[PDB]
RNA sequence: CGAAGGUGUGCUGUGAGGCAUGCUGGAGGUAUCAGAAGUGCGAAUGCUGACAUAAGUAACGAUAAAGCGGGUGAAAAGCCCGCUCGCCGGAAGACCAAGGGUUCCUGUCCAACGUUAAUCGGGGCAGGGUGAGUCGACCCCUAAGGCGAGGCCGAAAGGCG
RNA sequence: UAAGGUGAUAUGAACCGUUAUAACCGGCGAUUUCCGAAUGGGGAAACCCAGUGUGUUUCGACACACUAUCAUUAACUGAAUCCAUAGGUUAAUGAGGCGAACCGGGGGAACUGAAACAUCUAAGUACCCCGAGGAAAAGAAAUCAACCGAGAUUCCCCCAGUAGCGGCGAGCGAACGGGGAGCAGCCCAGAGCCUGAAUCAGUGUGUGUGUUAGUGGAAGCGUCUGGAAAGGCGCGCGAUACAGGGUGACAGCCCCGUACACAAAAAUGCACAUGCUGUGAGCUCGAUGAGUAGGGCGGGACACGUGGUAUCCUGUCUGAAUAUGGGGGGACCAUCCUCCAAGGCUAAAUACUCCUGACUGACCGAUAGUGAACCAGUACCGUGAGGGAAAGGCGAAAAGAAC
């Protein structure tokens, strides 16, 4: 999950990064302070996902 | 710009406790927890966005850590800002 | 400060001897004086803080001289 | 019995605050010697 | 370049019981290996009020060092050391005394 | 630990 | 099949000491001959820790003052409720500023803390609680005063403006 | 590298990975809030308030960038007067602050000693300030010597508690010369001939070596005591590996290591060869540092306290010759010998360790050793600078005592 959206174009990364911390990153936050998520292990996953993202934006975008 | 991703970090979680129930069902408002920061433009329009709801007015006031002496430790709990959201007369959540 | 611009003269400390050799710290002060020396290359007057020893340094080489000297050292005069 | 401590926040910041000693150069020599022992509060903070 | 892995049939050589046989389970990071029938203990567990109640005394496994242990050639009917080779481009182990492949 | 807002709070007399 | 250390006993040398051993101890010790010393404590109104004495003695912090019934509790003079009594009332009431920094409220606990007991508490643990266009800060303006671009002065630092 | 992992107190819950993108380690990158030289202005540090220029959902409002001071350079503007200068704006370059000691320079004590005390000593010490470096400073004779000779500076051992200085008291204390470590000499004050001509500094390429991850790494079993053996007993093997650490009592042969032999995609320091850039070889002639040397007055430094006092530096006032000239050779003069000041550059031997790795100790073993073996410069005390503790040990394994 790592190369896979390497290749992609800047438009579609802007639009994976959206819905990462749309759905999945504040859904998931609102389920842990209700106490309705139980796998809290998607929590981490899915900020590192936003990391990766981030990263390649930055390497893709100017420099 | 950055609005649409701010929006979706300054909430942080619903605030659930005695006086939080009786101001729902009451005035019709509900409390949250936001980001230190969290002005309260940002907080309305987050809430219109991300809950699909109309809001009349926000109150924002910052709680402060509580001091708690664990085992042979002094520590400090960090402060947090809630807010509190009045909805007009249609409510969804 | 106490500084000749064209020498470099400062203040210097030393002792003063009594009769009995008893010695207390003093401190020698260069004949500073404030001159205009008027420039025909500018055609103008520039004011130095300079010694007495300086003042005759002037008349001995050229006034234009010293203010290329003193321009290479560094500091507006 | 009056004493001789009357706290006062706004003197004390101004006295002895962090902008006071960087004001002159022995109070930065004060911050630097504090840092070298290794204090935690290099000044009284608000 | 660990000589014991998670599935190894080892055996013991110093302990409580020395020359019992078995199969490794799990090693931690301070050189210990649990084993099963080997190193067992009698642990007093307190009743929780939770979602589980063990009570009484549970016969637990306790870990042991990994030194302690050796794996077992199962050819010979000894305890035999390990070494590490590089066959085709990757490292294997094999014992000792007319040393084979694991 | 330390607290750093002693901003003043005056109720109307 | 038991080292150092600890604690007794019995022998031994004119002495500081040495040897053997009972019990505790639990893994280190070291002959002889030489070598080097942070090498020997009863005192220094010695230093640090521990423990005695006075002694179960003085004291328990305004001489405004308490009495009873019921409740809770293992236990009630002190906590809760009720009825009386007494005290302050330009305060011992109600508000702030400064200063404190959760001491506020609820549930629960009585080890330590409370100069006594304690179910009680400004004590322990957990949870909750501070909502502003109009209050204040912030902000605009300035007093004493501070800092101070250039500048003046000063061995340097720096002083004054 | 890998079959284990998601740092610790500290278990749990929910999960990843097991033949390769789980985790871990190393190189190179990205992100890097706010305060702090803090640098847009201000300020009670981690806060408040802006201007301009770039792009955008309801005008709403947002995102990014820039905007300190000083020095130098260039451009454009620009007074009192024509010109001009001062001044102003803009752009680029550099600096700012911090850091244990060592180095150079600018200032500079007192206690104390002299059995008092003032010269003197302490002492150019403590301390304050400035500047730079990995070292710094000094350094190629206007030096010594003795009329025999050596040839930059620096450091160590002698000379030597010697000669001298000294209320000739207390004390201070050389040089010449000798033995060592290490050695390197140059440039400008200027023209001509010849002009990459050696040596240097900055950027590419290639070899070697080293650092930043790592890989393999030999050889033991049976009985006795015992909670457990690595111990006793008996018989074996390895050693270019019995250095260490761990493992239920003391292990060369159980484990990690050790001697030994290997390893680098990428970044790097060092020594070479090969390119580019910039100053620059060699020969002839000439020149060869002036308010300076020296002197008067007042001080300081040289072991040398003004004494018969040479030599050097300087505050003040004076002031040459310039190579047929000048300086020194311890008052001074003559004769001899030696050198050429008033302009600069220069690694080596030398000083220290905030920090990193390895190794060592007739060093300490918890009132010791760093104040701190335990999240200590903490708690605590003080307005503040500042002062400043106590506190280590279950067991092999929590098997930490169900009932």
Not at chain 4, 21 to 41: D, E, I, P, S, Y
Request: hydrophobic content about 35%; aromatic content about 4%; proline content about 3%.
């Amino acid at each position: 999950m790592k190369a896979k959206e390497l290749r992609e174009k800047s438009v579609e990364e802007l639009n994976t990064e959206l819905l990462n911390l749309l759905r999945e990153q504040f859904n998931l936050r609102m389920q842990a302070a209700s106490g309705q998520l139980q796998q809290s292990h998607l929590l981490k996953q899915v900020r590192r996902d936003v990391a990766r993202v981030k990263t390649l934006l930055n390497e893709k975008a100017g420099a | 710009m950055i609005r649409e991703e701010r929006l979706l970090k300054v909430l942080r979680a619903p605030h659930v406790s005695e006086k939080a129930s009786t101001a729902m069902e009451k005035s019709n408002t509900i409390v949250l927890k936001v980001a230190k920061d969290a002005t309260k433009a940002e907080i309305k329009a987050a809430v219109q966005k991300l809950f699909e709801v109309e809001v009349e007015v926000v109150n924002t006031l910052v709680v402060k850590g509580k001091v708690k002496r664990h085992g042979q430790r002094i520590g400090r709990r960090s402060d947090w800002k809630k807010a509190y959201v009045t909805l007009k007369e249609g409510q969804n959540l | 400060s106490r500084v000749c611009q064209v020498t470099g003269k400062r203040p210097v400390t030393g002792n003063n001897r009594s009769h009995a050799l008893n010695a207390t710290k003093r401190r020698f002060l260069p004949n500073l004086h404030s001159h205009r020396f008027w420039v025909e290359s500018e055609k103008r007057f520039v004011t130095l803080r300079v010694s007495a020893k300086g003042m005759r340094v002037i008349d001995k080489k050229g006034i234009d001289t010293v203010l290329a000297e003193l321009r290479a050292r560094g500091e507006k005069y | 019995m009056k004493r001789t401590f009357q706290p006062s926040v706004l003197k004390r910041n101004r006295s002895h605050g962090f902008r006071a000693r960087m004001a002159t150069k022995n109070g930065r020599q004060v911050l630097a010697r504090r840092r070298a022992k290794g204090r935690a509060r290099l000044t009284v903070s608000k | 370049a660990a000589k014991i892995r998670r599935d190894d049939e080892v055996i013991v050589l110093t302990g409580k019981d020395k020359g019992k046989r078995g199969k490794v389970k799990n090693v931690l990071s301070s050189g210990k290996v649990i084993v099963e029938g080997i190193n067992l203990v009698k642990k007093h567990q307190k009743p929780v009020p939770a979602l589980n109640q063990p009570g009484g005394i549970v016969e637990k496994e306790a870990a042991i060092q990994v030194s302690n242990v050796a794996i077992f050639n199962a050819a010979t009917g000894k305890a035999d050391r390990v070494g590490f080779r590089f066959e085709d481009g990757k490292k294997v182990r094999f014992f000792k005394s007319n040393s084979e492949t694991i | 630990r330390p607290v750093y807002i002693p901003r003043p709070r005056p109720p109307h007399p």
